[PDB]
Amino acid sequence: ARGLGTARLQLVEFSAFVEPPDAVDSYQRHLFVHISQHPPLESVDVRQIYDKFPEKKGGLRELYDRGPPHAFFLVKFWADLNWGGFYGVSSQYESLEHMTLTCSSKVCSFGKQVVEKVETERAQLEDGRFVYRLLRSPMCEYLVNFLHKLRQLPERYMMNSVLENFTILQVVTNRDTQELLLCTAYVFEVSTSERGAQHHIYRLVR
Numbered sequence: 001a002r003g004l005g006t007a008r009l010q011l012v013e014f015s016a017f018v019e020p021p022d023a024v025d026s027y028q029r030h031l032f033v034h035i036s037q038h039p040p041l042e043s044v045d046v047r048q049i050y051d052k053f054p055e056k057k058g059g060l061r062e063l064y065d066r067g068p069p070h071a072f073f074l075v076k077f078w079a080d081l082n083w084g085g086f087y088g089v090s091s092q093y094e095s096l097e098h099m100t101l102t103c104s105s106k107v108c109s110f111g112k113q114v115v116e117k118v119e120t121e122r123a124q125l126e127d128g129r130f131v132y133r134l135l136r137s138p139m140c141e142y143l144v145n146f147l148h149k150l151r152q153l154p155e156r157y158m159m160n161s162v163l164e165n166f167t168i169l170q171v172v173t174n175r176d177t178q179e180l181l182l183c184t185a186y187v188f189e190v191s192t193s194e195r196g197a198q199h200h201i202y203r204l205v206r
């Protein structure tokens with residue numbers, strides 16, 4: 001694996017952003033986190049992140065046991081919290097086979113599920129490949145609220161302390177055959193002021 005994606009499904013873009021209200025006058029947007037995928041990746045042993053994701057039911061541990069392991073990834077984000085209009089999230093996946101996807105996103109706090117978002121995306125055949133777009137989806141209110149509180153902290157190390165207990169688990173399944181296609185675990189730190197968002201993608205091995 002050389003990127004976030006498998007033989008059956010590749011992540012092309014993900015971004016979490018805000019467009020200030022004056023973007024209508026002159027467009028701009030702030031990216032909190034961003035992955036653009038328009039030598040193999042480093043690996044991380046899954047035991048090292050087991051605590052950040054509750055055992056619970058159908059958690060990282062359970063899903064990873066069912067497999068296949070080449071479908072499991074860890075993304076480390078350095079979020080850019082240096083920026084009040086539209087808060088949005090955009091995702092795009094690609095595949096060679098025609099499928100209907102169910103994308104489940106679970107937000108955890110202190111290894112306890114807080115909110116869950118589930119959506120179904122159908123394929124658009126474009127240039128011999130199938131594309132799945134969910135663009136400009138409104139960011140869930142819990143995380144818009146979280147970002148506002150998070151930016152109020154006076155110290156970067158306090159934001160990292162808070163973000164230590166904050167994880168997202170994203171599961172993409174083939175809706176018709178129910179087989180898992182992709183599972184990404186996301187962990188978070190805050191980027192320093194001058195640096196924008198950054199990420200590091202790893203394969204989850206055990």
Ligand SMILES: CCOC(=O)c1cnn2c(=O)cc(-c3ccc(C(F)(F)F)cc3)[nH]c12
Nearest residue numbers: 016032033079089105139140143168170186
């Ligand atoms: C990481 C993968 O996320 C998703 O797949 C997804 C789906 N709905 N969704 C939101 O409705 C808000 C965020 C988000 C909001 C804020 C931040 C952060 F800036 F705090 F890091 C990160 C993700 N993320 C998501």
